[PDB]
Amino acid sequence: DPLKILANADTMKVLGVQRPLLQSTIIVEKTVQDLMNLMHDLSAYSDQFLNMVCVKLQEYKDTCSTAYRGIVQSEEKLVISASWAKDDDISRLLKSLPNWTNMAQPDFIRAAFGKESEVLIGNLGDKLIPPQDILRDVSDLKALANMHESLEWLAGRTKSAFSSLSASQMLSPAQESHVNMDLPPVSEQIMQTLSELAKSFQDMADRCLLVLHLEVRVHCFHYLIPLAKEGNYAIVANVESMDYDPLVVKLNKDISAMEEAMSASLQQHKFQYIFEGLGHLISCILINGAQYFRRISESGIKKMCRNIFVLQQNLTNITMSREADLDFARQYYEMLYNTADELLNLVVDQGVKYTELEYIHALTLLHRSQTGVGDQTTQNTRLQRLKEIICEQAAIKQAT
């Protein structure tokens, strides 16, 4: 219930908010408001009215926590995104990156994408994600999205209440050693309880947004990691067709459905935080995933390029900018059109662009797939010469 009924469109215009707010949040904030109004009139019972504010806010906090766990627990444990957000080290890293820190302000952020991708690839780049570890229903994602906006709003309202009380009774450090104790209209303990409820509503709001940000990314791994181990990219096709992976089609539908919900539930800069960076992550997934192919054929490369194109069109349309990292992943797979020897010539002619391991894994993939090399002794020799070509390129560049 408390994360379903949204406030009517005329309540938003009153409060001056341009995004859906939960009716339950509106109700508890109205009750706090009424309590705050009575403490100015019946100032003699200010403590009692304040204790009722804290209790009702604590009740709504507990009510939201319960609703959260119901969305986020699966088989008596957290889904991956929830597990990562709850984790201190991971949440600390994510909250320290410019895409979060500068979320509201209108390539440093592209380097922050590299850090998210590194953590995600490092821990998920070789894992099969079972269905019970992700959130499929957009209903749950939408519930998370306007729990975020609602609790962030409630945190702002609760913070204003605290600061109004604080400002009326604030003393300077020089005025402490003075005679007149007066009477603090509110005890420090009601103030501390109240300011912590405000922080708690913000922490809960931040968590929901983190979960949404990570959830789309985990979905990318769920659908794209099976891509490599399909045994479907080694087919020899003398004629070309518009065959591309159903998993990629499912990912696109998944991303689009989520894009639909977030746009109506979140402020734009929260929306952009969810969907920007997916291009970088997906390209990393596809480049890193090539090392799991047993065989690759020319038709398979054509199919992966269609996969990348389909994903590119969708993300470009969602983020309103071309995901250039997807071009980088396309160019990587186009390297596999070459022969094992031509691939080495490409590195000599145009320099080192991918990591050493990415080049080594490309050549090794070609050896497992192609036939224009022969015995293992010439393969080991070509592999060792590729490393020397990379060694030389580095030493040359560091000297100039």
From Swiss-Prot:
Component of the exocyst complex involved in the docking of exocytic vesicles with fusion sites on the plasma membrane. Belongs to the SEC8 family. GO terms for molecular function: ionotropic glutamate receptor binding; PDZ domain binding; protein-containing complex binding. It comes from the Eukaryota. Its main location: other. GO terms for cellular component: cell leading edge; centrosome; dendrite; dendritic shaft; endosome; exocyst; Flemming body; growth cone. One of its GO terms (biological process) is protein targeting to membrane. It comes from Rattus norvegicus. The exocyst complex is composed of EXOC1, EXOC2, EXOC3, EXOC4, EXOC5, EXOC6, EXOC7 and EXOC8. Interacts with BIRC6/bruce. Interacts with MYRIP. Interacts with SH3BP1; required for the localization of both SH3BP1 and the exocyst to the leading edge of migrating cells. Interacts with SLC6A9. It is found in: Midbody, Midbody ring; Cell projection; Cytoplasm, Cytoskeleton, Microtubule organizing center, Centrosome. Keywords: Acetylation, Cell projection, Coiled coil, Cytoplasm, Cytoskeleton, Exocytosis, Phosphoprotein, Protein transport, Transport. This is Exocyst complex component 4. The gene is Exoc4.
